[PDB]
């Protein structure tokens, strides 16, 4: 119902949905409990529980916490009743996984034991991702049955996981946990492995399998995860792999069936490598490279507009500081400042032909932007009396505006 | 009601070209090193919306 | 040697200085020229030339070409206008058919084409192509050939983005016809976009008889030559001896790069080359650059979250400016003086931004905390809460709204 040249007030600002998502996540990050019984660890405080209600060998809790050195928020995963018996279990694993930096893996910053919860506990410190939900929560939570995962979403998942496995396997490690419950949606279609270091520590020195063997099992788990998502059945419920594969074959492309089958197939004589798997999904990967860049551009668009809102804001403050001071005498009403007052009237005190005041936010933002830029465009400022008129460029105005402000700075 | 709240249904124009003035009129103005000034002859309300 | 791409640092798409970059690009978008000779077109105004040097060069299109930033009057947005000077369109079907194909195309590695139109408004026959505007873009030619070794990673990054463009173009039964360094623009750090896509399709519309598949095979060869030019620092026209250039590349870079470039150059294999086959061969690199794109996504989101309140702050300051000094009101004037006209004990002005933000924040919220507004001469004084103040300002504003 709006002409292409005309904008509603809020079109000049960040769209409501994005604004609300950011605000909610800001709120989730800043949430605290002033007097919980929960302890402060030496470098961690303001612990906040996240558990609404498996992969590890211990009962586990997750807390949002704030680091005392840098003031940032991290997610602390606690394993209850873990006893330190070999420090290498903690130290070697921490050394290895601290190297790992990957967009599809929740970063591990620290692994440490503590008695501060009143038991022996093992703590893993992670990047905090506000308002995250697991793939299990998102796809398998009943009521009504959960809807069919679109094939495109699945290839998006496959590519992000392949990205994780590429980095994990190259560092001679294995992503050991690939359950829906230990993969988190940190944003729309954006998934991250969230429990990576943990299995390495708990099974340290008890596991007899080689690195390569654990890596082979990663592919099988990868396949079962996709199979769970395709057919809507929990991994625990996946009793019949072939029956699940056929369901997938009916609902999805042959290309997907082939990918899942390669991942499940332990019968070939061939050592499976993430390199070979990537080779088989190059086209999908290219598509998602493109979409990532497009999403970058979208975020950059909004970022550029809000940074400019900030610059405008600081400029409006400078304006208010300069105009109508109680004051040399009359400094505000004389010389450079006089034009600035007339400029303010031009920007903010517009009126229709009918004399009705005009409140178009678009005019105000643009004018302040042009002033900041010192544009070579002329405008017509009229005296309050209405007898006299002045024609100035924004460039000229900026010179005046800067001079007026620098005078105040000098006065110090 | 937050103070930042502005009315949603106000419409702005964004496409318009910059103000072009009649050359006859610009002659009326008396040049200064920072710009031009003169007597308003036009029948436009002060700071009125201009349709370029 | 998978190592060069495996090594690439995580900041590959992240700007060195985001603040300065945004500010420069903001200024570039609003720039105009006080006395250009340039015309206003029916839907276009504020034309600004972007060509650094005013020299007639016709290399890719066969005609002199200019690029202008311009502002569309239909929607208020800025576009980049490619003008072919002295070009007369002889078949109108050329624009309609070509645009039907290319308007579908939306790709991170291709500058979107929106419109093609003829005009006499430059004082000649001219053909105009309207593109997305990318402020402060520079061509690969300007950036790599303007009087050191391009790192292999930068090259793989370029290769992945160009492959991305070619995937979309070839899938839509089209051909990127121009793959010259001068027609690929860096719109951001290590970020390239094909900038001349629609043009050859239009200019040669009747004349070129080669098939779609034939023009695509040529994409690969041109692609190969671009990489070869960058690797060895010699412009594509000077690339007289390809085998000699290939050995040079083989000495400075990995066997994988030599192999990829060789596949692109090879017309002898008897095999129809496909972008699907090429992507398959660079899958590892593509995964790395997918990761790097996503990490930049996280970086941008971080800054976005930090800047989210700026609109709210700006609108508040605007209402203050909208209400005051148009020609209860006295308290309002005193509040503005309290916030922005602070003075030191010595009478000198105080410019602490912190005071202004805290005050505007408390006003915004309508906090109950009480403040003391006094005229500088102490005769009159008021003790009010911010809650009371917001009530007052809002009433004033609602009066203004009523109209
Ligand atoms: N790194 C993280 N940042 C933010 N939130 C996280 C992070 N890791 C996990 N969480 C959140 O903690 C919550 C609990 O996760 P957890 O995996 O412990 O429970 P679960 O998967 O429901 O358990 P179960 O496997 O028994 O069903 C989830 O909603 C998840 O989004
Ligand atoms: N979509 C765009 N947005 C912003 N700037 C662009 C766009 N496309 C091209 N430019 C810029 O316009 C300038 C001129 O580009 P153009 O390719 O026309 O000339 P050139 O490459 O310098 O010389 P030649 O025309 O001989 O190739 C370049 O600096 C380029 O970065
Ligand atoms: Mg839990
Ligand atoms: Mg040019």
How far apart are the C-alpha atoms of C41 and C49, rounded to whole Å?
15
Short-list C402, B1, C368, C398, CA closest to C389: C368
- One fold for A1-294 and A295-412: no
What six digits make up the tokens of A348? Answer: 């903010």
Minimal-distance CA residue of chain A relative to B37: A390
CB contacts < 8 Å between B and C, how many? 39
Gap from A88 CA to chain B (nearest CA, Å): 56
Show the ligand 2 pocket: residues with CB < 6 angstroms.
Answer: C 50-52, 57, 59, 65, 67, 80, 111, 131-134, 137-139, 141-142, 182-183, 185, 195
3-state secondary structure at position C326: coil
Which residue pairs from A24-30 have beta carbons closer than 8 angstroms and sit at least 24 positions apart in sequence? Answer: A24/A130, A24/A131, A25/A130, A25/A131, A25/C305, A26/A130, A26/C305, A26/C308, A28/A64, A28/A130, A28/A131, A29/A64, A29/A73, A29/A128, A29/A130
3-state secondary structure at position C229: helix
Probe residue for ligand 1, chosen from A65, A186, A194 as the CB with the greatest number of ligand atoms within 8 Å: A194
Domain C283-329: assigned CATH number: 1.20.5.5160
Short-list C211, C223, C207, CA closest to C163: C223
Non-local CB neighbours of C385 within 8 Å, separated by 6+ positions: C367, C368, C369, C370, C371
Domain A295-412: assigned CATH number: 1.10.287.3700
- Please state the φ and ψ torsions of residue A6, each to the nearest 5 degrees: -100, 135
Q: Enter the DSSP assignment of C81.
A: E
Which residues, in sequence order, are bridge partners of residue A390? Answer: A381, B37
What six digits make up the tokens of B45? Answer: 């309300």
State in Å: Cα A160 to ligand 3 middle. Answer: 23
Cβ–Cβ < 8 Å for A278, A166: yes
Non-local CB neighbours of A159 within 8 Å, separated by 6+ positions: A281, A284, A285, A288, C287, C290
C-interface mutation test, from B2, B4, B47, most C Cβ less than 10 A away: B4
3-state secondary structure at position C304: helix
Set of chain A residues whose Cβ sits within 8 Å of the Cβ of C282: 282
CA atoms lying within 13 Å on the CB side of residue C374: 6
Q: Cα angle vertex C46, ends C54, C21, to 5°?
A: 75
How far apart are the C-alpha atoms of A141 and A143, rounded to whole Å?
9
What six digits make up the tokens of C90? Answer: 């002889």
3-state secondary structure at position C85: strand
Cβ–Cβ < 8 Å for A397, A340: yes
State in Å: Cα A104 to ligand 1 middle. Answer: 16
Among A7, A349, A388, the residue with its CB nearest the CB of B37 is: A388
Q: Which ligand ends up closest to the CA of A29?
A: 1
DSSP string covering C27-78 = HHHH---TT--PPPBTTEEEEEE--SS-----TTTSS-EEEEEEEESSSS-E
Which residues, in sequence order, are bridge partners of residue A145? Answer: none
CATH class of A1-294: mainly alpha
C-interface mutation test, from A6, A101, A187, A292, most C Cβ less than 10 A away: A292
What region, left, alpha or beta, does residue A375 occupy, with left being phi > 0 and alpha being psi -120 to 50 degrees? Answer: beta
Distances (CA, A) of B5 to A6, A152, C263, C312: 20, 39, 60, 8
Q: Scanning the structure block, which residue is given the tokens 């009601």?
A: B1
What six digits make up the tokens of A304? Answer: 């550029």
How far apart are the C-alpha atoms of A68 and C149, rounded to whole Å?
44
How far apart are the C-alpha atoms of C260 and C284, rounded to whole Å?
13
What six digits make up the tokens of C310? Answer: 């700026």
Gap from B12 CA to chain A (nearest CA, Å): 5
How far apart are the C-alpha atoms of A308 and C28, rounded to whole Å?
13
3-state secondary structure at position C185: strand
Set of chain C residues whose Cβ sits within 8 Å of the Cβ of B4: 311-313, 315-316, 364
How far apart are the C-alpha atoms of C171 and A183, rounded to whole Å?
33
Minimal-distance CA residue of chain C relative to A341: C325
**Which three-class secondary structure string do you get for chain A?**
CCCCCEEEHHHHCCCHHHHHHHHHHHHHHHCCCCCCCCCCECCEEEEEECCCCCCCCCCEEEEEEEECCCCCEEEEEEEECCCCCCHHHHHHHHHHHHCCCCCCECCEEEEEEECCCCCCEEEEEEECCCCCEEHHHHHCCCCCCCCCCCHHHHHHHHHHHHHHHHHHHHCCCCCCCCCHHHEEEEECCEEEECCHHHHHHHCCCCCCCCHHHHHHHHHHHHHHHHHHHHHCCCHHHCCCHHHHHHHHHHHCCHHHHHHHHHHHCCCCCCCCCHHHHHHHCHHHHHHHHHHHHHHHHHHHHHHHHHHHHHHHHHHHHHHHHHCCCCCCCCHHHCCHHHHHHHHHHHHHCCECCCCCECCCHHHHHHHHHHHHHCCCCEEEEECCCCCEEEEEEHHHHHHHHHHHHHHHHHHC
State in Å: Cα A59 to ligand 3 middle. Answer: 8
Contact at CB, C45 and B18, closer than 8 angstroms: yes
Set of chain C residues whose Cβ sits within 8 Å of the Cβ of B17: 40, 45-46, 73
> A25 CB less than 6 Å from ligand 1?
no
> A192 CB less than 6 Å from ligand 1?
no
State in Å: Cα B31 to ligand 2 middle. Answer: 39
3-state secondary structure at position C178: coil
Cβ–Cβ < 8 Å for C150, C144: yes
Distances (CA, A) of A362 to A43, A349, B5: 48, 13, 15
> A136 CB less than 6 Å from ligand 1?
yes
Rg of chain A on CA atoms, in Å? 30
What six digits make up the tokens of C103? Answer: 């308007």
| Ligand 1 atom at minimal distance to the Cα of residue A53 | 22
Report CA torsion sign: C365, C367, C372, C373. positive
What six digits make up the tokens of A279? Answer: 């080779």
Contact at CB, B3 and C364, closer than 8 angstroms: yes
Short-list C340, C368, C336, CA closest to C353: C340
3-state secondary structure at position C108: coil
Rg of chain C on CA atoms, in Å? 29
Among B9, B16, B19, the residue with its CB nearest the CB of A378 is: B19
Non-local CB neighbours of A45 within 8 Å, separated by 6+ positions: A65, A66, A68
Non-local CB neighbours of C143 within 8 Å, separated by 6+ positions: C186
What six digits make up the tokens of C10? Answer: 């995580």
| Ligand 2 atom at minimal distance to the Cα of residue C195 | 8
How far apart are the C-alpha atoms of A262 and A227, rounded to whole Å?
12
Short-list A103, A106, A304, A277, CA closest to A198: A106
How far apart are the C-alpha atoms of A207 and A99, rounded to whole Å?
23
Among C106, C281, C317, the residue with its CB nearest the CB of A313 is: C317
Is C330-403 in CATH node 1.10.287.3700? yes
How far apart are the C-alpha atoms of C228 and C245, rounded to whole Å?
7
Q: Cα angle vertex C204, ends C199, C206, to 5°?
A: 135
How far apart are the C-alpha atoms of C296 and C305, rounded to whole Å?
14
Gap from B50 CA to chain A (nearest CA, Å): 9
Short-list A110, A114, A106, CA closest to A124: A110
Work out the number of other CB atoms within 10 angstroms of the CB of residue A398: 17
Which residues, in sequence order, are bridge partners of residue C343? Answer: C349
Angle between helices A282-322 and C353-365 (to 10 degrees): 100
Number of domains composing chain B = 1
> A186 CB less than 6 Å from ligand 1?
no
How far apart are the C-alpha atoms of A114 and C184, rounded to whole Å?
56
Contact at CB, A285 and C282, closer than 8 angstroms: no
C: neighbours with 3+ CB pairs under 8 Å?
A, B
CA atoms lying within 13 Å on the CB side of residue A332: 12
Set of chain B residues whose Cβ sits within 8 Å of the Cβ of A14: none
The approach used to solve this structure was X-ray
Contact at CB, B40 and A386, closer than 8 angstroms: yes
How far apart are the C-alpha atoms of A386 and A394, rounded to whole Å?
21
Q: Scanning the structure block, which residue is given the tokens 């809807």?
A: A147
Gap from B27 CA to chain A (nearest CA, Å): 12
How far apart are the C-alpha atoms of A324 and A371, rounded to whole Å?
19
Domain C1-282 architecture = Orthogonal Bundle (1.10)
Cβ–Cβ < 8 Å for A285, C290: yes
How far apart are the C-alpha atoms of C219 and A382, rounded to whole Å?
60
Minimal-distance CA residue of chain B relative to A391: B36
Q: Where are the domains of chain C?
A: 1-282, 283-329, 330-403
State in Å: Cα C179 to ligand 2 middle. Answer: 13
> Whole domain around residue B31: which residue ranges?
1-52
How far, rounded to the nearest angstrom, does the alpha carbon of residue A20 sit from its chain's CA centroid? 14
């Amino acid at each position: 119902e709006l002409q292409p040249w005309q904008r509603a007030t809020y079109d000049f600002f960040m769209p409501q949905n994005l604004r609300e998502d950011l605000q909610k996540k800001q709120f989730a990050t800043l949430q605290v409990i002033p007097n919980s019984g929960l302890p402060q660890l030496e470098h961690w405080h303001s612990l906040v529980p996240l558990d609404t209600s498996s992969c590890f060998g211990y009962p586990s809790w997750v807390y949002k916490a704030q680091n005392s050195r840098n003031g940032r928020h991290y997610a602390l995963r606690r394993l209850e009743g873990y006893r330190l018996t070999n420090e290498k279990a903690i130290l070697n694993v921490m050394k290895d996984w601290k190297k790992i930096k990957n967009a599809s893996i929740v970063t591990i910053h620290e692994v440490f034991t503590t008695r501060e919860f009143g038991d022996s506990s093992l703590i893993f410190a992670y990047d905090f991702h506000p308002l995250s939900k697991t793939l299990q929560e998102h796809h398998f939570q009943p009521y009504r049955p959960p809807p069919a995962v679109p094939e495109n979403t699945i290839w998006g998942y496959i590519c992000q996981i392949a990205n994780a496995l590429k980095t994990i396997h190259s560092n001679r490690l294995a992503a050991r946990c690939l359950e829906p419950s230990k993969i988190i949606l940190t944003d729309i279609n954006r998934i991250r492995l969230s429990a990576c270091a943990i299995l390495d520590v708990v099974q340290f020195g008890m596991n007899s399998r080689s690195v390569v063997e654990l890596q082979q099992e990663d592919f099988v788990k990868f396949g079962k995860l996709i199979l769970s998502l395709a057919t809507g059945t929990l991994p625990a419920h996946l009793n019949n792999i072939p029956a699940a594969l056929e369901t997938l074959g009916n609902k999805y492309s042959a290309n997907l069936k082939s990918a899942v089958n390669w991942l499940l197939d332990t019968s070939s004589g061939e050592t499976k490598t993430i390199e070979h798997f990537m080779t088989g999904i190059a086209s999908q990967m290219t598509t998602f490279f493109d979409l990532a860049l497009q999403d970058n551009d979208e975020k950059l668009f909004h970022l550029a507009r809000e940074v400019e809102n900030g610059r405008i804001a600081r400029s409006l403050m400078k304006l208010l500081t300069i105009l109508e001071r109680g004051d040399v005498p009359s400094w505000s009403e004389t010389g450079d400042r006089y034009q600035l007052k007339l400029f303010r009237d031009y920007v903010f005190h517009r009126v229709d032909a009918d004399g009705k005041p005009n409140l178009s936010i678009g005019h105000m933002l643009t004018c302040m932007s042009k002033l900041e830029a010192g544009v070579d465009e002329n405008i017509l400022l009229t005296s309050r009396d209405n007898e006299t008129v002045f024609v100035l460029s924004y460039r000229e105005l900026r010179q005046m505006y800067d001079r007026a402000f620098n005078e105040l700075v000098k006065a110090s | 009601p937050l103070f930042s709240a502005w009315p949603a249904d106000i419409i702005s124009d964004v496409g318009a070209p910059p103000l072009q003035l009649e050359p006859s009129f610009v002659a009326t103005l008396k040049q200064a090193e920072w710009g031009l000034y003169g007597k308003n002859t036009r029948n436009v309300r002060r700071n009125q919306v201009e349709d370029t």
